[PDB]
Amino acid sequence: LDEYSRQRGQITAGGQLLAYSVATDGRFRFLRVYPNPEVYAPVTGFYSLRYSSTALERAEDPILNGSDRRLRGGNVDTTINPRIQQAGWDAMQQGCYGPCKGAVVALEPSTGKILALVSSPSYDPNLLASHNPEVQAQAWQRLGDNPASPLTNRAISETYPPGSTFKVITTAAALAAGATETEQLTAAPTIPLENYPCGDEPTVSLREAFVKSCNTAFVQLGIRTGADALRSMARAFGLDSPPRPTPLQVAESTVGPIPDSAALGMTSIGQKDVALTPLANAEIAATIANGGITMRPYLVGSLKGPDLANISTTVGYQQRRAVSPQVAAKLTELMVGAEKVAQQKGAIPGVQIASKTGTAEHGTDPRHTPPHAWYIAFAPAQAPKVAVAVLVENGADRLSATGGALAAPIGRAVIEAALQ
Structure with missing residues (x-):
């Protein structure tokens, strides 16, 4: 009253x-x-x-x-840019031949401003x-x-296996530990895990593995690098640390215990117990975009x-350095490569995008349930003004190179609106 x-x-x-x-x-x-x-x-x-x-x-x-x-x-x-928020929303309502369930997050890499925070369905x-x-x-x-839980803010309150997008962390960990981009990894369809064969050769370079759908290559790379370095890199990127308020509360992202080499193999490709919010996946992109420095999201x-x-x-502050500027530059190259290999639906003329697209199995029967589609990206790759993460729940397709291709045009429409 x-x-x-x-x-x-x-x-x-x-x-x-x-x-x-x-x-x-x-x-x-x-x-x-x-x-x-x-x-x-x-x-x-x-x-x-x-x-x-x-x-x-x-x-x-x-x-x-x-x-x-x-x-x-x-x-x-x-900090919301209405043109960005609207483009995320619209793309999520049209992007699954109709409405998508999932989230879009847009961040300004240099400041940490939250430019868009989209959840679908909404209310x-x-x-x-x-x-x-x-x-x-x-x-x-x-x-x-x-049953779709429209009240849930999927961008910050729900965690999902990152799947293929977690290869960004596996790669960062390997590069920080002296791995080279010409180092040979298996291209076999299966490894004693399956690819979503990586190429017509028995082995590919790390670069080629990163740009394609080669789970087996990354199982091997993760196992070669080891659990100590993978956990430590995951922590560097904010995983397993309670996030700060935005002032909205964000669910904690985690890498999981990693009990054995089998779990290490699985973690390296963003499965097993790895679970991230869409915001945390956008922060990973924004960190790489910002030369290895994570700015606190607000x-x-x-x-x-x-x-x-x-x-x-609000004062913007440098949370932590996740990677050296050199490793961030290498990840950037690799992500430009991964964007280039992708079919170019929603491509922006004269704008170079750095990205990682893929899928994440989930649920009590991951082998039959439609995996999620993820797209994480930043642009312009060489002087970044926006980082995005798109999660489309059960959005993985069985035809594209990465299986995550439905998330990509959503991410690109968000970037387009940000750069206008």
């Missing part, structure tokens, strides 16, 4: 409103409005009479409700902001009963008073 008699502040992105409150005739005076609701639900969350709040409505509640000591409520200016927070008790309850019930650019006087501006 009291809370709703004051005008809750706004959540914005790029001068656009993501959430605001309007003075109405309701017993509770102010109605929360979400003008592009499904698109921005992972960022705004909801603010509900009956069901409380989520995401930024919850995380910035003191600022928005006016009670924050630093302080009409205050406003929250996000309309206006349903929960309704002042009708019954409209709220019915919506809560329908969302909770939906979603709130600044906080403002009711008068739009600035209360706080």
Whole structure:
């Protein structure tokens, strides 16, 4: 009653409103409005009479409700670029011959700004902001009963096997330990794991292995490098360390225990117990993009008073160096190569993309369930302004070179929108 008699502040992105409150005739005076609701639900969350709040409505509640000591409520200016967020959303609604389930994350590699945070399917927070008790309850019930779980922010709260994309870490680990790009790895269809034969020869170079679908090559490389170095590289890239708030909580990514050489073989190709959020996979891309330095991801650019006087501006900071500049340059070359080999649906004229596309088996029967499709990338490869990760749940195809090809045009449309 009291809370709703004051005008809750706004959540914005790029001068656009993501959430605001309007003075109405309701017993509770102010109605929360979400003008592009499904698109921005992972960022705004909801603010509900009956069901409380989520995401930024919850995380910035003191600022928005006016009670924050630093302080009409205050406003929250996000780092979201609306043109990028919209392109991610649109591509995810069209990219699976219809709507995809999964996530898109876009990061600015030099700063750590979160440029897009997309989850699909999504939901309309206006349903929960309704002042009708019954409209709220019915919506809560329908969302909770939906097997696709539209309430889940898949970008940050859910982890998935990274599969093929984890070869970026396996490679970093090997290169840091003195492996060369001409070093020979097996091209056999099976290794005592299967390829999704790597080539017409018994062995290929590391480069050629990286650009193609050669699980067996990477099993061997991972095993050759060993568990000590693989774990240590995974940690360098943020895995198995509790992530910092964005201010939204991010689920912890992990490499798993790795009990034996068999598990090491499996881990090296992003299976076994390796599990990453889409944000963590985008951070890996952004780290490589940024010459080996991981910047801390953040979603709130600044906080403002009711008068739009600035209360706080987020400082960007260097979390950690994951790899030397030299190793980051080598990974970049390899990823430019992997993008070049791919069929060029959604290619941007005059823009060089560095990427890694692939699949990840999952579930209690990974050999029969459709694997996930992943695309992680950054661009322009030689002076990067954007890093992306695309996860399409069960999106792997049985025809493309990598099996992950459906995720790639989604990633490219996001990059296109970022560079415009």
